[PDB]
Each structure stands twice: as C-alpha cells, then as structure tokens.
C-alpha cells in the first residue's frame, strides 16, 4: 500500500522541471526526490553526529 499516494505530480502552473534524483543518507538506502539540476546521484554527508574524540579518530583513520 506504499504506492497509494505516490502516483502524483506538481499541481501548479508556473514551476521548474524536476527530475527523479536518487538521494542517499548515511545508511546505504536510496530515496527518489524530484529536484532540479538532474544529477543522478546525490549523497548527503555527516560531520556533527559524532563527538570531538570520534571526529579526531575518523580524521586519523582517513
């Protein structure tokens, strides 16, 4: 039933063209979002979920 309210569109007169962009968070999952600038892959990063010690450890590992 997840595809119940998905088969829709933008219901306005003046609007830019949007594309089915595949966006990924820090989980590996993908979501389809209508967005300009039709880049196929968008990845959203993270820099604040960790603490200072964890950030320093990640920087050292990098």
């Amino acid at each position: 039933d997840c595809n119940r309210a998905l088969l829709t569109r933008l219901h306005r007169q003046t609007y830019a063209r949007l594309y089915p962009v595949l966006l990924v968070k820090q989980d590996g999952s993908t979501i389809h979002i209508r967005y300009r600038e039709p880049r196929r892959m968008l990845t959203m990063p993270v820099d604040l979920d960790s603490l200072s010690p964890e950030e320093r450890r990640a920087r050292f590992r990098k």
């Binding site: 820090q26 999952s29 979501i31 990845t43 959203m44 820099d47 604040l48 990098k62």
Partner: protein, 140 residues
C-alpha cells in the same frame, strides 16, 4: 529604578497587544525568477492516438482506484468489527480490564515514524566527509 520598570512593562504590554501573524510560506508564492521564461515555451501539439491512449489510461486508473478504495475500506471495516467484537468479549468477561484498556498509554505522544526506501540499507557504508549550514530566511 521604578520609572524604568514602569516603562519596560508598558513596552512589554504594547508588544503583547500587537498582532501574531504567521511566517509567509515560500512554497505558495512564485519567485520572480520564473517571470522571465514563460514567453519562450513551445507547444506540445498532442495528437489523436495519444489522446485516445491517455483517455483510456485515465478511465482504467479511475476504475482501479475505485476497486482499491473499496478493498481498503473493506479492510478497515473488518478490522473495526474485529476490535469491537474483542472489546465486547472482554467487557463481558471482566469490567476492570475493560476500564484499564479503554485508556491511552503515556508512551504514544512522541510517535515518530519513517517510511520505506527504494533500496535496503548498505552495511559498512561510510560517507567521506561534509558539513552543513542553515540558509533559510528569517522574518520578524
């Protein structure tokens, strides 16, 4: 000392007596960036066979939507009948459990929920790096 407090309270009361309008929503208002591209749009000239196919597709979708709505309301009514039967059975059995069950739990107020995704999460996945900032507007 006292005069300053009196003036401060008067200003506070005057500010409180003012209006409480909401923040205008940028979604419902078209930005001025879109007023310079309307005059160049070419037409589509939709043809007859495609019009026929679109009309038939819409009719089929309407019938399918009616059928799925009927199925979904049937499911809701079956669930409601099951719940009503269970509640009546428990009321017939014992009233104290009915009284303690017809209330709401204190752990349902902060109900957070997330839907599914196009792909399952990938194990051992690490983002390279990247920070964030707020670029939203402000209104007073």
């Amino acid at each position: 000392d006292q005069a300053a407090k009196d003036r401060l309270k008067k200003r506070i009361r005057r500010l409180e007596k003012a209006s409480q309008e909401l923040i205008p929503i940028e979604d419902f208002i078209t930005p001025v960036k879109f007023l310079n591209k309307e005059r160049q749009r070419p037409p589509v000239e939709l043809p007859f066979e495609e019009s026929e196919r679109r009309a038939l597709l819409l009719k089929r979708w309407s019938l399918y939507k009616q059928r799925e709505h009927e199925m979904e309301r049937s499911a809701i009514r079956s669930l409601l009948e099951a719940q009503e039967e269970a509640l009546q059975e428990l009321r017939l059995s014992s009233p104290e459990l009915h009284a303690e069950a017809t209330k709401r739990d204190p752990s349902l107020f902060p109900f957070e929920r997330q839907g599914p995704d196009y792909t399952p999460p990938i194990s051992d996945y690490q983002p390279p790096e990247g920070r964030y900032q707020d670029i939203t507007k402000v209104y007073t």
